[PDB]
Design an enzyme around this catalytic site. Structure first.
Site, PDB file in Angstrom:
ATOM      1  N   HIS A  72      21.147 -87.114 -60.519  1.00 42.31           N
ATOM      2  CA  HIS A  72      22.525 -86.894 -60.081  1.00 42.31           C
ATOM      3  C   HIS A  72      22.842 -87.668 -58.819  1.00 42.31           C
ATOM      4  O   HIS A  72      23.960 -88.161 -58.663  1.00 42.31           O
ATOM      5  CB  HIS A  72      22.772 -85.398 -59.825  1.00 42.31           C
ATOM      6  CG  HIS A  72      22.439 -84.526 -61.000  1.00 42.31           C
ATOM      7  ND1 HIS A  72      23.143 -84.568 -62.186  1.00 42.31           N
ATOM      8  CD2 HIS A  72      21.498 -83.565 -61.149  1.00 42.31           C
ATOM      9  CE1 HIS A  72      22.632 -83.683 -63.024  1.00 42.31           C
ATOM     10  NE2 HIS A  72      21.632 -83.065 -62.422  1.00 42.31           N
ATOM     11  N   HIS A  85      21.818 -86.435 -49.013  1.00 36.79           N
ATOM     12  CA  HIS A  85      22.096 -87.255 -50.176  1.00 36.79           C
ATOM     13  C   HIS A  85      23.517 -87.769 -50.026  1.00 36.79           C
ATOM     14  O   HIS A  85      24.239 -87.390 -49.094  1.00 36.79           O
ATOM     15  CB  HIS A  85      21.973 -86.436 -51.458  1.00 36.79           C
ATOM     16  CG  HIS A  85      22.925 -85.287 -51.504  1.00 36.79           C
ATOM     17  ND1 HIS A  85      22.662 -84.058 -50.934  1.00 36.79           N
ATOM     18  CD2 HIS A  85      24.199 -85.230 -51.946  1.00 36.79           C
ATOM     19  CE1 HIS A  85      23.710 -83.267 -51.105  1.00 36.79           C
ATOM     20  NE2 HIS A  85      24.674 -83.970 -51.682  1.00 36.79           N
ATOM     21  N   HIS A 103      27.284 -89.110 -52.282  1.00 34.26           N
ATOM     22  CA  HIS A 103      28.099 -89.239 -53.484  1.00 34.26           C
ATOM     23  C   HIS A 103      28.880 -90.531 -53.303  1.00 34.26           C
ATOM     24  O   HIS A 103      29.341 -90.825 -52.197  1.00 34.26           O
ATOM     25  CB  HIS A 103      29.104 -88.075 -53.550  1.00 34.26           C
ATOM     26  CG  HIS A 103      28.459 -86.716 -53.572  1.00 34.26           C
ATOM     27  ND1 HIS A 103      28.078 -86.066 -54.731  1.00 34.26           N
ATOM     28  CD2 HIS A 103      27.972 -85.974 -52.553  1.00 34.26           C
ATOM     29  CE1 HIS A 103      27.493 -84.918 -54.415  1.00 34.26           C
ATOM     30  NE2 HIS A 103      27.387 -84.858 -53.100  1.00 34.26           N
ATOM     31  N   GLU A 159      33.875 -86.990 -51.948  1.00 36.58           N
ATOM     32  CA  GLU A 159      34.202 -85.686 -52.516  1.00 36.58           C
ATOM     33  C   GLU A 159      35.375 -85.059 -51.784  1.00 36.58           C
ATOM     34  O   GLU A 159      36.423 -84.800 -52.383  1.00 36.58           O
ATOM     35  CB  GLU A 159      32.964 -84.788 -52.557  1.00 36.58           C
ATOM     36  CG  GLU A 159      32.084 -85.311 -53.626  1.00 36.58           C
ATOM     37  CD  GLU A 159      30.948 -84.422 -54.017  1.00 36.58           C
ATOM     38  OE1 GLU A 159      30.388 -83.630 -53.225  1.00 36.58           O
ATOM     39  OE2 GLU A 159      30.794 -84.365 -55.247  1.00 36.58           O
ATOM     40  N   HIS A 164      26.036 -86.067 -47.288  1.00 37.00           N
ATOM     41  CA  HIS A 164      25.874 -84.628 -47.125  1.00 37.00           C
ATOM     42  C   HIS A 164      24.499 -84.358 -46.547  1.00 37.00           C
ATOM     43  O   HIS A 164      23.490 -84.580 -47.223  1.00 37.00           O
ATOM     44  CB  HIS A 164      26.030 -83.934 -48.475  1.00 37.00           C
ATOM     45  CG  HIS A 164      27.428 -83.953 -48.970  1.00 37.00           C
ATOM     46  ND1 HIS A 164      27.775 -83.660 -50.273  1.00 37.00           N
ATOM     47  CD2 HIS A 164      28.585 -84.153 -48.306  1.00 37.00           C
ATOM     48  CE1 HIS A 164      29.088 -83.751 -50.400  1.00 37.00           C
ATOM     49  NE2 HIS A 164      29.603 -84.034 -49.216  1.00 37.00           N
ATOM     50  N   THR A 166      28.894 -78.566 -54.232  1.00 37.71           N
ATOM     51  CA  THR A 166      29.811 -79.352 -55.053  1.00 37.71           C
ATOM     52  C   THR A 166      29.205 -79.744 -56.391  1.00 37.71           C
ATOM     53  O   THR A 166      29.854 -80.473 -57.142  1.00 37.71           O
ATOM     54  CB  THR A 166      30.256 -80.627 -54.331  1.00 37.71           C
ATOM     55  OG1 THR A 166      29.123 -81.495 -54.168  1.00 37.71           O
ATOM     56  CG2 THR A 166      30.860 -80.285 -52.971  1.00 37.71           C
ATOM     57  N   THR A 167      27.991 -79.301 -56.698  1.00 37.60           N
ATOM     58  CA  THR A 167      27.374 -79.492 -58.002  1.00 37.60           C
ATOM     59  C   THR A 167      26.930 -78.132 -58.498  1.00 37.60           C
ATOM     60  O   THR A 167      26.674 -77.230 -57.700  1.00 37.60           O
ATOM     61  CB  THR A 167      26.141 -80.410 -57.946  1.00 37.60           C
ATOM     62  OG1 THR A 167      25.158 -79.859 -57.060  1.00 37.60           O
ATOM     63  CG2 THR A 167      26.515 -81.781 -57.460  1.00 37.60           C
TER      64      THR A 167
HETATM   65  N1  VYV Z   1      26.707 -81.654 -52.838  1.00 38.18           N
HETATM   66  S1  VYV Z   1      26.287 -80.376 -51.828  1.00 38.18           S
HETATM   67  O1  VYV Z   1      27.337 -79.351 -51.881  1.00 38.18           O
HETATM   68  O2  VYV Z   1      25.982 -80.792 -50.470  1.00 38.18           O
HETATM   69  C1  VYV Z   1      24.789 -79.644 -52.483  1.00 38.18           C
HETATM   70  C2  VYV Z   1      24.667 -79.393 -53.833  1.00 38.18           C
HETATM   71  C3  VYV Z   1      23.496 -78.833 -54.299  1.00 38.18           C
HETATM   72  C4  VYV Z   1      22.491 -78.523 -53.413  1.00 38.18           C
HETATM   73  N2  VYV Z   1      21.303 -77.907 -53.942  1.00 38.18           N
HETATM   74  S2  VYV Z   1      19.787 -78.595 -53.682  1.00 38.18           S
HETATM   75  O3  VYV Z   1      19.550 -78.890 -52.278  1.00 38.18           O
HETATM   76  O4  VYV Z   1      18.765 -77.633 -54.110  1.00 38.18           O
HETATM   77  C5  VYV Z   1      19.676 -80.140 -54.628  1.00 38.18           C
HETATM   78  C6  VYV Z   1      19.702 -79.872 -56.129  1.00 38.18           C
HETATM   79  N3  VYV Z   1      18.348 -79.564 -56.528  1.00 38.18           N
HETATM   80  C7  VYV Z   1      17.958 -78.234 -56.952  1.00 38.18           C
HETATM   81  O5  VYV Z   1      18.739 -77.347 -56.996  1.00 38.18           O
HETATM   82  N4  VYV Z   1      16.564 -78.052 -57.316  1.00 38.18           N
HETATM   83  C8  VYV Z   1      16.030 -76.777 -57.749  1.00 38.18           C
HETATM   84  C9  VYV Z   1      16.689 -75.978 -58.664  1.00 38.18           C
HETATM   85  C10 VYV Z   1      16.128 -74.764 -59.042  1.00 38.18           C
HETATM   86  C11 VYV Z   1      14.917 -74.354 -58.506  1.00 38.18           C
HETATM   87  C12 VYV Z   1      14.257 -75.162 -57.595  1.00 38.18           C
HETATM   88  C13 VYV Z   1      14.819 -76.369 -57.216  1.00 38.18           C
HETATM   89  C14 VYV Z   1      22.620 -78.752 -52.063  1.00 38.18           C
HETATM   90  C15 VYV Z   1      23.777 -79.333 -51.593  1.00 38.18           C
HETATM   91 ZN    ZN Z   2      26.625 -83.394 -51.951  1.00 36.09          ZN
END
Ligand code: VYV
Ligand code: ZN
Ligand code: VYV
Ligand code: VYV
Length: 257
Positions: free
Chosen positions: A61, A91, A93, A103, A116, A195-196
């Protein structure tokens, strides 16, 4: 599963993640004429001197630069926040074209990309617990415009060839995230969500007013990444942004006049 394509993109997410239509979804458009200056807001405190980056991962992603969050090493405090929030990853976008990719929007303006820096509230013990809390996360959002190169981004740019496809990771130690910040820490803030998917409503958003500028060659290299895994049909990792969602019963506050 979810993505950014026509058949699995943001308009589809609500079917598996009904909170996509919730009351505090992100991103949002920041109407600079409706956001109100709040004098009770404090300066933000970004303490990244002891940051320990570890690894960079293409997760299909975006790409995440991950940090050691098992001690207070890189923390965000102050601003609208109560307590200490630890940096776990950053990360971006970005778009297929320089005119889109962010975003959040500012008076409907789209930037080329958005950084972000994701932090979690230490009172909840770990990130997985934090995402279940309305004040679990603080995400520092920074807009990217295309112009002059950002020197502190180049080390990221240069490792992307080694994580071209989904599931690839590379060692990425000793990276200083302070090189990604603009000069000013003036910001807007509002309560929102990831946002995901799973789109959890757990984020205090802090969006910096001042964008950073990156070169066209730097953002072009983001666009050479792949959403797919190795051996699957090549799909360029571009336009991995969710559009602005309804503000609903929320106020965006500004730290500045
Ligand atoms: N775009 S944003 O709003 O800033 C944003 C959006 C999503 C996250 N979540 S995250 O950091 O976990 C990255 C995604 N990875 C996982 O969820 N992995 C996972 C999943 C289930 C169990 C163990 C690991 C953080 C910031
Ligand atoms: Zn993000
Ligand atoms: N609601 S969603 O997560 O975007 C989602 C989940 C699955 C599909 N399609 S499919 O892969 O099963 C065939 C599309 C969207
Ligand atoms: N150990 S570390 O090097 O500091 C580290 C570990 C993972 C990441 N990846 S991440 O930032 O994208 C967050 C991924 N999402 C989760 O881990 N969710 C979760 C967590 C606990 C329970 C249930 C779900 C970054 C740094």
């Amino acid at each position: 599963h979810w993505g950014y394509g026509k058949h699995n993109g943001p308009e589809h997410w609500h079917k598996d993640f009904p909170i996509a239509k919730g009351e505090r979804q992100s991103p949002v458009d920041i109407d600079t004429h409706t956001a109100k200056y709040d004098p009770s807001l404090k300066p933000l405190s970004v303490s990244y001197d002891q940051a320990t980056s570890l690894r960079i991962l293409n997760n299909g992603h975006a790409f995440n630069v991950e940090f050691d969050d098992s001690q207070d090493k890189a923390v965000l405090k102050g601003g609208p926040l109560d307590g200490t929030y630890r940096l776990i990853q950053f990360h971006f976008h970005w778009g297929s074209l320089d005119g889109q990719g962010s975003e959040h929007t500012v008076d409907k303006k789209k930037y080329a990309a958005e950084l972000h820096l994701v932090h979690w509230n230490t009172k909840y013990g770990d990130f997985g617990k934090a995402v279940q809390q309305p004040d679990g996360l603080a995400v520092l959002g920074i807009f990217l415009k295309v112009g002059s190169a950002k020197p502190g981004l180049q080390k990221v740019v240069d490792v992307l060839d080694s994580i071209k496809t989904k599931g690839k990771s590379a060692d990425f130690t000793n990276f200083d995230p302070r090189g990604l910040l603009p000069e000013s820490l003036d910001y807007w803030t509002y309560p929102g969500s990831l946002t995901t998917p799973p789109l959890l409503e757990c984020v205090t958003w802090i969006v910096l007013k001042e964008p950073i500028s990156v070169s066209s060659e730097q953002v072009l290299k983001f666009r050479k990444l792949n959403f797919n895994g190795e051996g699957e049909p090549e799909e360029l990792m571009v336009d991995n942004w969710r559009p602005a969602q309804p503000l609903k019963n929320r106020q965006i506050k500004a730290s500045f006049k």
